[PDB]
Amino acid sequence: SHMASMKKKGSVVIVGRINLSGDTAYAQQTRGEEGCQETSQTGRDKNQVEGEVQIVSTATQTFLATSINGVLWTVYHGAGTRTIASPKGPVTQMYTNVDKDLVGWQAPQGSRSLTPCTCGSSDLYLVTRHADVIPVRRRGDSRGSLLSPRPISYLKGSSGGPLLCPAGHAVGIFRAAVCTRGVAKAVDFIPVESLETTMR
Numbered sequence: 001s002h003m004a005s006m007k008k009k010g011s012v013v014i015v016g017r018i019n020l021s022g023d024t025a026y027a028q029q030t031r032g033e034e035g036c037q038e039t040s041q042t043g044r045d046k047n048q049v050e051g052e053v054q055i056v057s058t059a060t061q062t063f064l065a066t067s068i069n070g071v072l073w074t075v076y077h078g079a080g081t082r083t084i085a086s087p088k089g090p091v092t093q094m095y096t097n098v099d100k101d102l103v104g105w106q107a108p109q110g111s112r113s114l115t116p117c118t119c120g121s122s123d124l125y126l127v128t129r130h131a132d133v134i135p136v137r138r139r140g141d142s143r144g145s146l147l148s149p150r151p152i153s154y155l156k157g158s159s160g161g162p163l164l165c166p167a168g169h170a171v172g173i174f175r176a177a178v179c180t181r182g183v184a185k186a187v188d189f190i191p192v193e194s195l196e197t198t199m200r
C-alpha cells in the first residue's frame with residue numbers, strides 16, 4: 001500500500017548468443033552476472049548484438065530468444081511483461097500473448113533474423129542454450145519427438161530457442177518439454193505460423 005517504495009521489475013538482458021554462423025555451433029557469453037544485474041535495473045544495454053539466437057536473463061531466470069521477421073521472440077514464462085534492455089533504455093514488448101506463452105520485442109540493431117519456413121518438412125533441429133543441435137521429428141502442429149531422448153536437465157533454459165528445418169528456416173519456438181520420469185521424449189513448440197498470426 002506504500003506506493004513510493006514500490007519496486008520495479010528489471011528488464012530482460014541479452015547476456016550472450018548461440019553462434020551458428022560457421023561450421024560449429026557454440027555458445028558465447030557477452031555479459032557477466034554483475035553487469036547483467038546492473039543492466040536489468042537501468043534498462044540501458046550498449047553491448048553489440050549479433051546473430052539470430054540470443055541468451056537472455058532476468059534477475060531470476062535465464063533462457064533464449066530468437067529473431068524471426070525482425071522481432072526478437074521468447075516465452076512469457078521467462079520474460080513475463082518485462083521490457084528488454086537496449087542502447088537507448090528499456091523497450092516495451094510489441095507482442096504479448098500469455099495464451100501462447102509468447103512475447104516479442106523489436107529485434108535489436110545488429111541481430112539477424114531467421115526466415116519463416118515454407119518447406120512443409122518434418123525433419124527438424126532444436127538448438128539449445130549449450131549450442132547442442134538436437135534432431136527432432138515433427139509429430140503435429142506443435143509437437144516433435146527427440147530422435148534421442150535426453151533428461152530434461154539437458155533442455156532446461158532453452159525455452160525461446162528455435163526449431164529449424166534442414167535449410168535453416170525457423171519452424172517454431174521451443175516452449176515446453178514433454179517429459180516422462182524426467183526424460184524428454186518430445187518437445188512442445190510455438191509454430192512460426194502462430195507468430196505470424198500474432199504479428200497481424
Ligand SMILES: C=C[C@@H]1C[C@]1(NC(=O)[C@@H]1C[C@@H](Oc2nc3cc(OC)ccc3nc2Cl)CN1C(=O)[C@@H](NC(=O)OCCCCC)C(C)(C)C)C(=O)NS(=O)(=O)C1(C)CC1
Pocket residue numbers: 061062063064076077078098099100101152153155156157158159174175176177178179188
Ligand atoms: C525443460 C525445458 C523446457 C523448455 C522449458 N519450458 C518449461 O519449463 C515450461 C514452462 C511451463 O510451461 C508453460 N508455462 C506457461 C506460463 C505462462 O505464464 C506464466 C503462460 C503460458 C505457459 N505455457 C507453458 Cl507450456 C512448464 N514447462 C515445461 O516444460 C514442463 N512441461 C510441460 O508442461 O509439458 C506440458 C505442456 C506441453 C506438453 C505437455 C516441464 C517443466 C518439463 C514439466 C524451459 O527451458 N524453461 S526455462 O528456460 O528453463 C525457464 C523456466 C526460465 C524460463
Ligand SMILES: [Zn+2]
Pocket residue numbers: 116117118119120121165166167168169170
Ligand atoms: Zn524450411
